[PDB]
Design a protein around this nucleic acid. Structure first.
Lengths: 84, 57, 84, 303
DNA sequence: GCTTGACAAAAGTGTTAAATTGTGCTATACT
């Protein structure tokens, strides 16, 4: 008893991953390539964690209010104008 | 060099030399500790970490 | 051989064993080794050699007393080699 | 000749900064982030801006990133001055430095020029934490979560302190009491702290043999057993012959001798098409037949 | 030679509460 599932990597390589006939078939599979692969047939239901990695903007917004930033930008722009 | 130039460390003496390494490197730790630590808020017990001493023997 | 002594170091009995060790026991076995053919004998002058054979006391070069000799040593010391 | 020498020759080229310069670069960086975010938000909200001004904001970014890079390249010395103290603790000097630079990068991202504190004041925290956190995540061949590396060091601290007060290594009870945890926990903790040893080491005298050579492969096959096991399979085959055709198959399926996977009474009764109780009854009789002296005496030796 | 319904133990399965684990952070100044 062997199920043959094929996944597709982002770079274009394909892989065959034999599974048991009775068990569920995943939608994404860590392949020999080292990258994630999506299965070709069976629909994916891929529930992406959807966790937005914290960025430099997040760290600045949590200390400067948008008004303080707007005032600073005016200072910089009023400075670049003067340079002309 | 010459034969007579041989010293011959005795058991007690070459043991002491190993202690020197333990004490000296212990003072190297106390120098670093006292600068970062608050003055008068530290004692010999807090500055002395005898680990390199006992671990040396 | 025979078992001489046993030393048992337990955990219930507080004792003091490396972390994780519960019980520690050591058995001492003794052996009475008869001088056997193959063993290595030697004198104080560097002469050494194994026991090639052990004859019964009956068939052994014996003095006129009937007093058998204990060991028969060949003339190891070649000339110049000496071992005086 | 030497690499750590090279890294120092380059960071030493950058010119250190005064209190006034830090704030200017800090300002340019924050202006760069907001300018970049404003341009992205205006497209989302379907808004436009004056042509000349919009192009001015774009340059604010190029100047903002130059500020970010300039701010880091100036305080690289600070990272090294902090990385010197953690050498020899199981982490190469450079690795400490690079991890310090990672911490340094974050300090720049969170520094606040409005507080008026010198930059080195707030950067030392992140650079320091970046190095320590790195050691707990990389120093050990067998990784230990930081919280466990945290408690292990706390226990060694109590141990060292208790060692200095009592004049004797504190027992698990003394060490557990002072640390407000069970003595068995400190023991379990003391097992985690142990680090591995090198197989490539030389325990034999004068490199006669490395340590790894003395490790048994207990999983390797045992020739005598593979033969006895083979003779046992052959002997059971004969014993199976004495049983009923169906009765022999039931014993095979019940223990999985044929397909290597046992089957419950229902499954066995499903292949023979009878109740699961009937299979239970049949099996019991097989065992009685198997315990008969004629059929069973031959297999005792196989324990 | 077989099945029924009882009953139980054992094996699962879904739902929750610890605990374990990973990340962020600390503002005299410190190069």
């Amino acid at each position: 008893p062997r199920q043959v599932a094929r996944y597709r990597t982002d770079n274009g390589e394909e892989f065959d991953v034999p599974f048991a006939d009775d068990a569920e078939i995943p939608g994404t599979w860590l392949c020999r390539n080292g990258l994630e692969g999506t299965l070709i047939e069976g629909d994916v239901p891929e529930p992406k964690k959807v966790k937005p990695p914290r960025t430099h903007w997040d760290m600045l917004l949590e200390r400067r209010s948008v008004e303080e930033l707007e005032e600073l930008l005016k200072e910089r722009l009023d400075l670049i104008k003067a340079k002309r | 060099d010459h034969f007579g130039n041989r010293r011959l460390r005795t058991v007690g003496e070459l043991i002491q030399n190993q202690i020197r390494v333990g004490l000296s490197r212990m003072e190297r730790v106390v120098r670093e500790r006292m600068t970062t630590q608050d003055v008068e808020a530290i004692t010999p017990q807090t500055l002395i970490n005898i680990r390199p001493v006992v671990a040396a023997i | 051989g025979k078992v001489i002594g046993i030393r048992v170091f337990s955990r219930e009995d507080d004792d003091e064993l490396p972390a994780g060790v519960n019980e520690l026991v050591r058995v001492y076995v003794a052996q009475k080794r008869k001088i056997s053919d193959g063993d290595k004998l030697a004198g104080r002058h560097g002469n050494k050699g194994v026991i090639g054979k052990i004859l019964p006391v009956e068939d052994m070069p014996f003095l006129p007393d009937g007093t058998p000799v204990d060991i028969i040593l060949n003339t190891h010391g070649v000339p110049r080699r000496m071992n005086i | 000749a030497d690499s750590v020498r090279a890294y120092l020759k380059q960071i030493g080229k950058v010119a250190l900064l005064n209190a006034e310069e830090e704030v200017e670069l800090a300002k340019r960086i924050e202006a760069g982030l907001y300018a970049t975010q404003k341009l992205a938000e205006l497209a989302e909200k379907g808004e436009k801006l004056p042509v000349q001004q919009r192009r001015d904001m774009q340059w604010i970014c190029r100047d903002g990133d130059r500020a970010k890079n300039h701010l880091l390249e100036a305080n690289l010395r600070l990272v090294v001055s902090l990385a010197k103290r953690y050498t020899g603790r199981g982490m190469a000097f450079l690795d400490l430095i690079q991890e310090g630079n990672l911490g340094l990068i974050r300090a720049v991202e969170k520094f606040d020029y409005t507080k008026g504190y010198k930059f080195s004041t707030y950067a030392t925290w992140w650079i320091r934490q970046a190095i320590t956190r790195a050691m707990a995540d990389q120093a050990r061949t067998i990784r230990i979560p930081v919280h466990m590396v945290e408690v292990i060091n706390k226990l060694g601290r109590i141990q060292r302190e208790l060692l200095q007060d009592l004049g004797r290594e504190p027992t698990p009870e003394e060490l557990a009491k002072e640390m407000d945890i069970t003595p068995e926990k400190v023991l379990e903790i003391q097992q985690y702290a142990r680090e591995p040893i090198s197989l490539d080491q030389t325990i034999g005298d004068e490199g006669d043999s490395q340590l790894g050579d003395f490790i048994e492969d207990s999983e390797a096959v045992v020739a005598v057993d593979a033969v006895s096991f083979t003779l046992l399979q052959d002997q059971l085959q004969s014993v199976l012959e004495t049983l009923s055709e169906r009765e022999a198959g039931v014993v095979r399926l019940r223990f999985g001798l044929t397909d290597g996977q046992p089957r419950t009474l229902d499954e066995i009764g499903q292949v023979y098409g009878v109740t699961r109780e009937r299979i239970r009854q049949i099996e019991s009789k097989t065992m009685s037949k198997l315990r008969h002296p004629s059929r069973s005496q031959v297999l005792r030796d196989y324990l």
